[PDB]
Design a protein around this nucleic acid. Structure first.
Ligand SMILES: [Mg+2]
Ligand SMILES: [Mg+2]
Ligand SMILES: [Mg+2]
Ligand SMILES: [Mg+2]
Ligand SMILES: [Mg+2]
Ligand SMILES: [Mg+2]
Ligand SMILES: [Mg+2]
Ligand SMILES: [Mg+2]
Ligand SMILES: [Mg+2]
Ligand SMILES: [Mg+2]
Ligand SMILES: [Mg+2]
Ligand SMILES: [Mg+2]
Ligand SMILES: [Mg+2]
Ligand SMILES: [Mg+2]
Ligand SMILES: [Mg+2]
Ligand SMILES: [Mg+2]
Ligand SMILES: [Mg+2]
Ligand SMILES: [Mg+2]
Ligand SMILES: [Mg+2]
Ligand SMILES: [Mg+2]
Ligand SMILES: [Mg+2]
Ligand SMILES: [Mg+2]
Ligand SMILES: [Mg+2]
Ligand SMILES: [Mg+2]
Ligand SMILES: [Mg+2]
Ligand SMILES: [Mg+2]
Ligand SMILES: [Mg+2]
Ligand SMILES: [Mg+2]
Ligand SMILES: [Mg+2]
Ligand SMILES: [Mg+2]
Ligand SMILES: [Mg+2]
Ligand SMILES: [Mg+2]
Ligand SMILES: [Mg+2]
Ligand SMILES: [Mg+2]
Ligand SMILES: [Mg+2]
Ligand SMILES: [Mg+2]
Ligand SMILES: [Mg+2]
Ligand SMILES: [Mg+2]
Lengths: 155, 260
RNA sequence: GUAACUUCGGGAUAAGGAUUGGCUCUAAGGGUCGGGUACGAUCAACUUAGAACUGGUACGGACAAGGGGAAUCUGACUGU
RNA sequence: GCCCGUCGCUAGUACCGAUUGAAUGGCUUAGUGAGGCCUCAGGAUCUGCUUAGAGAAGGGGGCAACUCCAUCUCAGAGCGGAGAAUUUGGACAAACUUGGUCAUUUAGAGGAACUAAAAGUCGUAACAAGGUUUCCGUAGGUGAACCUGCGGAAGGAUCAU
RNA sequence: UCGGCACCUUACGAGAAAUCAAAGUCUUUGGGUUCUGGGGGGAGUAUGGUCGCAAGGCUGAAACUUAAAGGAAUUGACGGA
RNA sequence: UUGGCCGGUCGGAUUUCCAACGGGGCCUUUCCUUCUGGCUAACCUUGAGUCCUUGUGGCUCUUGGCGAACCAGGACUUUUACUUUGAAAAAAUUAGAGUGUUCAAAGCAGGCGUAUUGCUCGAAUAUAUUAGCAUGGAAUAAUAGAAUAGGACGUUUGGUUC
RNA sequence: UAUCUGGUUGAUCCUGCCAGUAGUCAUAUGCUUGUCUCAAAGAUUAAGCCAUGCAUGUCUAAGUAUAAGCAAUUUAUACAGUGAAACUGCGAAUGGCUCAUUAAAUCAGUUAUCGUUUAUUUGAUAGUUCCUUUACUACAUGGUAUAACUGUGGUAAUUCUAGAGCUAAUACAUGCUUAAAAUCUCGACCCUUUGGAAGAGAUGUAUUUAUUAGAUAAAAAAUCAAUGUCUUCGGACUCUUUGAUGAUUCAUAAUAACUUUUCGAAUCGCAUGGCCUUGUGCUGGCGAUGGUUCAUUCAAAUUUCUGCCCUAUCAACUUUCGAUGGUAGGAUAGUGGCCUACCAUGGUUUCAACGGGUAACGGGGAAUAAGGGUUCGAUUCCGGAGAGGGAGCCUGAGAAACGGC
């Protein structure tokens, strides 16, 4: 997200307290702030060499990942910088001594470091309430192949 | 609700005070103080239920209002004063110095000490952090703030507090092979120093401990209190040294000394 | 916002209920002009939505312009 | 022998039913909209200074360097504070009125049933080849059990040319 | 020999029996899965929805009433067998 | 771990004398993702000497010693379910140890002298599910991997960033 | 304590319910009732209505006493003991009672606050107070303005109060004295330049903003603003302070300021020491009570994951009066559609959403039980809600409080 409309907004989108001194020409021309969220969750390079803002990003923004870390499959990417993921599980009734498929849907903030899509298993980490519903931010995207290189039109 | 509660229901008390179910509807609520409500021991519980000096809670008032008890060298005339772990309790008359330590059952021992050991105490370092004007301070398990420590003192260690001037005399580092007093849960009152410490970056660090009889027992790090080197405790240990004799062994000893 | 009933086309503008001026603005919505064997001059129209301010709370300001509902009989209807 | 109905006696239970039937609870388009809060004002009072005008009171080193903190009778051009009633605008919003809608409860002349139920009257539809083999779906007809057409089944009165 | 419609004999088994190589491998109870039933009536009724031009179809009660209704076989009795 | 036999303690320590369970390692073609620096390996390597009366049960300043007998970073991570173990799990209640409330329901008391300067035991533990955390297993039940090879392995090119 | 038995028939064997049987910490009711222990008790129906009385007040040597109170002092002519009243402070936000709402809501276990507030407790913590210093004001100690009270009154009546006059503070409002150095900024007094200086101010802590530091893989070098403080004028300079967390724009510290400038003791009891300029001079102990911040403790708020009864004669719900998200603001104690403005079209559902019922508060738990289950839980503990219904608010750390408005 180095390019392609960082500023499309009524307010000026910038990181808080990151002063770009205009006199001193240091050969980066925009200081960028990042952190690691902890717990082995790497800071992706497209956050470092990308130039999105995302005040709710776990790396470049002002949210701290702490609490539960969950995993789930992305089902819906039709908001802006937010997804809902499906947490499928089995629930056990003791009378039948058997299990039932339940699920809960969890809306998760996606940083614009990642390029998620539906059907992607993804690692999400708890934060403060981002929205009315969102409490989790994507800390790691666990899609590897997706079986999509063997399906298109052939000679 | 609407704010802080002032009452403790009996049978909502912490169980390790051994309060009888009947003969009174209410428990002594621990006041605000150095130790938590469920980790403390009010002076009325000490002076009437553990020492049997007072019959009522009114004679606990008649003792504290003659400047008799002193916790950590200071009198503390509160009846429900929350004296907790490692607290030295001095009685001037009777000349008795006690140190509130856990017996192996998970309760509070009626454990006398002497004056050179009553002159100090131990405190587990809760946090190390710079205070204002840059002054470093360390926080102990009884909430004491002591400024300018040794820079080697980190969290989960133990410092020896001089208790007259509340000064760090020396400190026991938290490392392998050093006497761990487990201070919470079902393992409450168990010693044994180490196996190792497992990290769990994310929360709830766990510490493996194996006592004199080589019984390993895993405990969370937040229940760990370091009280010395291998052997050589920095305080007098209670009558039983925190070994956890099982009930088969416990029935074996009591029959071994009831026929003399 | 809108019922019963219905031949499912209607009933229906059902019933009910808010708004409407003036002024100063804002926002959309066009046409003609152009490329290398990361571009805006130019003109024109009245619709719609929004905002503020304003006033003896007036505002479809004259004019113009459905009263409505629940039932019964009777002829299906338009027409004569 | 058993058994089916029609009709009739008594008693009970629900169902439809004119009555825009009634009652409680909502919930909601709308209209009015208290009160407190915040806010635009307000300024009865109830004060502390101080005056360039008599305010009958030295300019706080001193009555020659346009430089040294300075108060009574009243209007005050100098201020400054506290400030009650009242008021504007909001936002929260009780409550009232009206309509829509939902759900529960309750009244109803009367109609259409079921049961107690074995007993009355009429026929005998089923059970025997029950005297027209029975039953099922459908249609039409009959005081009525039913009858009749069409197709089915055998739980048939035929396991068989 | 493969597959099918059946049948015959026996009954290891099954069932209350009539019977059944499936209706067996079931208190020595678990191969997988769908639908249905919970004493008889009221009643496939009322109401509501839904489908159909309608006849009606699908879904589908409760109040109330009842001590038996039913299944299979035995012996009799009776048959305009 | 049953014990297991000097029965010498008038049928009462003991032990490879063993068999069956229960684990841990090593090798047989056998993952243990990984380079760093504090371990200096049950010392892969045994200068110097075995004053004990014969064995395969009892040692030193060592020839730079797989610096790999755990502490914090990655060229670092296919995910579950299941099950074991453990924390953390309020008490009361329930199960349940102790204890003559005279018994018992209960309660958490109590017990013992020299009762004169008083001694002392307790107030256990299990279960407390399902979810969450750590943990050992890797059968069973899934899931994923290399087929248009955009495959895996390579300690001694470092390009537009770092 | 893994048990069945009576009832269909002339008789049999079944399906099958009816009936018996036994508990109930499960209610009512009938009959009867001597002892001892133990003890639920207006939940159901009406969270319907309430007469009366009580249920929340509080004083130590340690805030304020001229009672015209009492005792009657202990150089005690400021007071000295006791103390009604009243002011001040604190409490009244706990308890207790009830279960009406409330079906992912509460609640239970389990996370989070790196998303915040917090009286009290406990531990620490404050030499700077000078407006613009070369325009300081009692600090051996500032002011008015009031209660109680005296006295005069209104009303049938209230825990009503009016006008006048007194008087205190730990109430209210002002306001100083407790070093010394550094380091910046300004600054009358640098000739042929790697050429300074008395003085003058500021620098505690709160506030609010901006900027900086809060570090790190081990070692080597020759050029170009740079002789970057390389000394026989090139005898290559021999050199890193920085806490914590898994993770930060954390703790902390610094620079420039900003503020209807917060705090930095005009307070009280007891004991009256010691020293030499004997002046009632200077230092002086143990406390009490206030106070700023940071931790602690009691909490509070919101929060992750998972779990609740029946119904599809409830299949589509939410989005004009936020629905789901983004961006910014406002508000908050803070996160956040919490609200507002603009923009996008989301979010949920046959794995039962949305809706309807509940004589539904949730849990610990209780009754029955071979095992599995079934049913209850208003109710001695814990969490929630409510004080007739709603709504709003003051005070206070804490209430949308009801023995407050
Ligand atoms: Mg949002
Ligand atoms: Mg309460
Ligand atoms: Mg109209
Ligand atoms: Mg009409
Ligand atoms: Mg006509
Ligand atoms: Mg005609
Ligand atoms: Mg006609
Ligand atoms: Mg006509
Ligand atoms: Mg006949
Ligand atoms: Mg016939
Ligand atoms: Mg026949
Ligand atoms: Mg039949
Ligand atoms: Mg064949
Ligand atoms: Mg039935
Ligand atoms: Mg049906
Ligand atoms: Mg119908
Ligand atoms: Mg017993
Ligand atoms: Mg029965
Ligand atoms: Mg007697
Ligand atoms: Mg009642
Ligand atoms: Mg009750
Ligand atoms: Mg009730
Ligand atoms: Mg009442
Ligand atoms: Mg006193
Ligand atoms: Mg009570
Ligand atoms: Mg207090
Ligand atoms: Mg005081
Ligand atoms: Mg936003
Ligand atoms: Mg935002
Ligand atoms: Mg915002
Ligand atoms: Mg209820
Ligand atoms: Mg419950
Ligand atoms: Mg309950
Ligand atoms: Mg309340
Ligand atoms: Mg208060
Ligand atoms: Mg209220
Ligand atoms: Mg109350
Ligand atoms: Mg009340």
């Amino acid at each position: 997200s180095t390019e392609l409309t960082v500023q499309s907004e009524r307010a000026f989108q910038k990181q808080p307290h990151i002063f770009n001194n205009p006199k001193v020409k240091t050969s980066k021309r925009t200081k960028r702030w990042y952190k690691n969220a902890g717990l082995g969750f790497k800071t992706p390079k497209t956050a470092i060499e990308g130039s999105y803002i995302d005040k709710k990003c776990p790396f470049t923004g002002l949210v701290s990942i702490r609490g539960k870390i969950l995993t789930g499959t992305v089902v819906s990417t039709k908001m802006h910088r937010t997804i809902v993921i499906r947490r499928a599980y089995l629930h056990y009734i003791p009378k039948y001594n058997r299990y039932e498929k339940r699920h809960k849907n969890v809306p998760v903030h996606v940083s614009p470091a990642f390029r998620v899509q539906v059907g992607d298993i993804v690692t999400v980490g708890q934060c403060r309430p981002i929205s009315k519903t969102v409490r989790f931010n994507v800390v790691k995207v666990s899609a590897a192949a997706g079986k999509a290189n063997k399906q298109f039109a052939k000679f | 609700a609407r704010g802080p509660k002032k009452h403790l229901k009996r049978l909502a008390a912490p169980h390790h005070w051994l309060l009888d179910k009947l003969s009174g509807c209410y428990a002594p609520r621990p006041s605000a103080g150095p130790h938590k409500l469920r980790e403390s021991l009010p002076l009325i519980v000490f002076l009437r239920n553990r020492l049997k000096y007072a019959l009522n809670g009114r004679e606990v008032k008649a003792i504290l209002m003659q400047r008799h008890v002193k916790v950590d060298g200071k009198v503390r005339t509160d009846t429900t004063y929350p004296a907790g772990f490692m607290d030295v309790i001095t009685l001037d008359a009777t000349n008795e110095n006690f140190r509130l330590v856990y017996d192996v059952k998970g309760r509070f021992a009626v454990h006398r000490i002497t004056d050179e050991e009553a002159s100090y105490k131990l405190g587990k370092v809760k946090k190390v952090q710079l205070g204002k004007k840059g002054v470093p301070y360390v926080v102990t398990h009884d909430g004491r703030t002591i400024r300018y420590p040794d820079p080697n003192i980190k969290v989960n260690d133990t410092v020896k507090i001089d208790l007259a001037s509340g000064k760090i005399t020396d400190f026991i580092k938290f490392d392998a092979g050093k006497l761990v007093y487990v201070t919470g849960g079902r393992n409450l009152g168990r010693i044994g120093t180490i196996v190792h410490k497992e990290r769990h970056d994310g929360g709830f660090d766990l510490v493996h401990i194996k006592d004199s009889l080589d019984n390993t027992f895993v405990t969370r790090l937040n229940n760990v209190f370091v009280i010395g080197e291998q052997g050589k405790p920095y305080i007098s240990l209670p009558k039983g040294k925190g070994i956890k004799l099982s009930i088969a062994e416990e029935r074996d000893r009591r029959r071994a000394q009831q026929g003399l």
